[PDB]
């Protein structure tokens, strides 16, 4: 079936998490398709189903496990399986709909949520912005549990949204950005949870537009500047792929 990368929060270390993330990147882009030095995700179009998803199996010291499904085209979480049951974010269209049906085929219980997995929706449901939701090994530990128990009714909706926002940023966004990978490490190193500051959020929001500005740049020069924020919320602009070499690790396919 689809490839599985295993991770556990129990005795998680910086290397543990770093190895896991690199592992995940490796499984997303194996093609070495690269533009302006930044690897590019596979192109959605004419992608054989077999190559569309990858699974991330997560488990905690309490021995509760779930398996996320990530889309190799965007790196994003499309849903998860736990034990008997499996849940999916709302597909954006017919195509993405047919696709999910190849995930977790064996699962006895199949459900597709009415809502999508985009931040706007998830922050609405969580009752908090990403600014107010802490990240760390502990937060991730709880997120696993909260997904496991959902199948059984022991998880409230906001807690589920909240738990997704934690995984998306600790896995997908961390894959997409060495910078975000980094911020998570610091949190793990000290077993200290904290919500993401604007430098993080303005990145997460801008992945698409950065993926574009890059792939469409003139010899690396952005046709138009992409604006981001610093830790203190002060605005600054990015004119060149050069400054992002160390920042972003992946881009969705464009052109």
């Amino acid at each position, epitope marked *: 079936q689809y490839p599985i990368i295993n991770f556990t929060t129990a005795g998680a270390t910086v290397q543990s998490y770093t190895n896991f993330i690199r592992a995940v990147r490796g499984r997303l882009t194996t093609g070495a398709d690269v533009r302006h030095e930044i690897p590019v995700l596979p192109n959605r179009v004419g992608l054989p189903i077999n190559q569309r998803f990858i699974l991330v199996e997560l488990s905690n010291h*309490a*021995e*509760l496990s779930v398996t996320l499904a990530l889309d190799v085209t965007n790196a994003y979480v499309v849903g998860y399986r736990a034990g008997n049951s499996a849940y999916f974010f709302h597909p954006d269209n017919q195509e993405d709909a047919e696709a999910i049906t190849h995930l977790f085929t064996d699962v006895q219980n199949r459900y597709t949520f009415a809502f999508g997995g985009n931040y706007d929706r998830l922050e609405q449901l969580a009752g908090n912005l990403r600014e107010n939701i802490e990240l*760390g090994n502990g937060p991730l*530990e*709880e997120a696993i549990s909260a997904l*496991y128990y959902y199948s059984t009714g*022991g*998880t409230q909706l906001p*807690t589920l949204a909240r738990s997704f926002i934690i995984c998306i940023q600790m896995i997908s966004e961390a894959a997409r950005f060495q910078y975000i990978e980094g911020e998570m490490r610091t949190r793990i190193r000290y077993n200290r949870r904290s919500a993401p500051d604007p430098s993080v959020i303005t990145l997460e929001n801008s992945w698409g537009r950065l993926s574009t500005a890059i792939q469409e740049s003139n010899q690396g020069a952005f046709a138009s500047p992409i604006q981001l924020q610093r830790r203190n919320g002060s605005k600054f602009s990015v004119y060149d792929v050069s400054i992002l070499i160390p920042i972003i690790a992946l881009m969705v396919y464009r052109c």
Partner: nanobody
Amino acid sequence: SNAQVQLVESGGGLVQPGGSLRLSCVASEFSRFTLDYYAIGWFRQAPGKEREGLSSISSSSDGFTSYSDSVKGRFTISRDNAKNTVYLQMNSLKPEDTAVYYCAARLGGWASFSPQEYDYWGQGTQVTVSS
């Protein structure tokens, strides 16, 4: 029957306003997992009231804790692992706090004020603040 655990609360009673009580959640021997694997919450219920969440502690190894506005700077939830126990220390007690207090637990859980998010419950104990 993984995660099966019995919780016995105690430490409740009558106190003059401005007093202090220490409750206790003791997990009975022979649960497959010990209590440190658990989140424990603490709730109080008035006769008319439904269960209301007060203090909480996560299964998370960073010892993250939650406190409701009502009890902040007064209640402190803590752990003794070699005793397989979780204390809740109530200071500066006011008559408003009079109620039945419960401890609840969830294996690998998170700090929550929701009764639905815990699994195993204590038998409850009365707290009374008067003079």
